[PDB]
Structure formats: structure tokens, C-alpha cells
């Protein structure tokens, strides 16, 4: 099964990134599920209640499963010998 389901807590979403904590604030928000919250950006990620770039990218990284589906993975190849 790739991705989650709509019916999916906010709290196991950003658990794959070791932030399920940021479930409060987006609960509170009116989106206590990544079916409710799909559509978010970084902008909106702001007034959504976060500071942390760091963990932002981390998000959003997740959110474009799907089409491509690609989280937590390498990205290098070959350095000089």
C-alpha cells in the first residue's frame, strides 16, 4: 500500500518525520487528518503554527507522495575516486 489514507491522523503523518507534536496545532486548526490538511504549502505552513524551516521542508517533502511518491531516500552518486 503506497501513501496513507485519507482517514489518516494528523498525529501519524508528521510522526514519519519524528514531529507528530505539531498534530496539536493542526488539529486545532481544523485538520486533525492528512485527508483534511492536503493542499498546504510552505507559506501557509507558517501561519499553520510553524517556525522550524527545517522541519517544514520536512513535511512538504511528504505531502508530494503520491504522484511520484519519494520520502526518505539517498541523493548522491560518486564523489572523486
Given at each position: ?44 505552513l507558517k501561519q499553520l ?33
Amino acid at each position: 500500500h503506497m501513501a496513507a489514507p485519507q482517514d489518516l491522523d494528523i498525529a501519524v503523518w508528521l510522526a514519519t518525520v519524528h514531529l507528530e507534536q505539531y498534530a496539536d496545532t493542526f488539529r486545532r486548526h481544523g485538520l486533525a487528518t492528512a485527508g483534511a490538511a492536503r493542499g498546504l504549502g510552505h507559506e501557509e505552513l507558517k501561519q499553520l503554527g510553524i517556525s522550524a524551516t527545517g522541519h517544514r521542508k520536512r513535511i512538504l517533502r511528504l505531502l508530494q507522495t503520491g504522484t511520484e511518491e519519494g520520502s526518505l531516500d539517498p541523493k548522491s552518486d560518486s564523489a572523486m575516486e
